């Protein structure tokens, strides 16, 4: 049930990185993987506002 | 030799029209400098120039230089009754002697809805009117602007002066004056250290041969 992998802090001194709660120290780890979903816009008014827009079509994925 | 294409055009838009007429700006001018009814009122109120006032928006350039004339009528009631022919007009001095300004910088002869005006010395006469480039250059028979010319205070109000001549500014556009039929057609640039904008003034082509 625990952890795998953890970063080592950049750091110009570490003694024996291996982490803490346990598992593997690394310098680079694997990567952090981010997604979203592109919001997609409610109709706008038809006339021209400098605003950001604030209506969004409700979405997952 | 190599010389710019005369332009045969009038412009269909004017130097301060440039703007899309349906946005606004990002920048602000100053709307207001007091609240009202006297008595130590004062402030400072800022507002987005915009459509509704188009006069106070910011702009990337200015209409050319002017050197101003006086203004005539064709109709001889209006005009005053002395003679002004040459006491009143335009002029350059140089070594000593007088010569009249002709035809001059290239100048909007007439404002928009007054045809009956021209310039003393403004237009050639074999009377044509330059009025097509009133778009880019100011008329001839008007102050270019006006600056201020104190500090303001408490104690002393804003106060204006009228631009009667105004040379070159960085940032100016302007038309030279139009070519005729029966007009000239070259000049000779004379020779020199320096010149600017070497277009002669009575029309056509500046060469330095």
Do not use: C
Request: without cysteine; glycine residues 8%.
């Amino acid at each position: 049930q625990g952890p795998i992998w953890a970063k080592i802090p950049h750091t110009d001194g570490n003694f024996h990185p291996s982490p803490l709660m346990g598992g593997f120290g690394m310098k680079h780890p694997p990567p952090q993987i981010l997604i979203k979903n592109t919001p997609v816009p409610a109709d706008p008014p038809t006339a021209f506002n400098k605003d950001k827009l604030n209506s969004f079509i409700t979405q997952y994925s | 030799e190599n010389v710019p294409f005369h332009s045969s055009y009038a412009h269909s838009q004017s130097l301060d029209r440039l703007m899309n007429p349906l946005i606004d700006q990002y920048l602000y001018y100053l709307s207001k400098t007091i609240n009202g009814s006297g008595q130590n009122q004062q402030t400072l109120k800022f507002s987005v120039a915009g459509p509704s006032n188009m006069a106070v928006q910011g702009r990337n350039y200015i209409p050319g230089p002017s050197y101003r004339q006086q203004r005539v009528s064709t109709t001889v009631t209006q005009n005053n009754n002395s003679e002004f022919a040459w006491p009143g007009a335009s002029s350059w001095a140089l070594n000593g002697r007088n010569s009249l300004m002709n035809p001059g910088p290239a100048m909007a002869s007439h404002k928009e809805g007054e045809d009956r005006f021209f310039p003393l010395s403004g237009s050639l006469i074999f009377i044509t009117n330059e009025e097509e480039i009133k778009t880019t250059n100011p008329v001839a028979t008007e102050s270019y602007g006006q600056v201020a010319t104190n500090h303001q205070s408490a104690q002393a109000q804003a106060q204006t002066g009228w631009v009667q001549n105004q040379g070159i500014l960085p940032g100016m556009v302007w038309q030279d004056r139009d070519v005729y039929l029966q007009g000239p057609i070259w000049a000779k640039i004379p020779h020199t250290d320096g010149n600017f904008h070497p277009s002669p003034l009575m029309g056509g082509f500046g060469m330095k041969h």
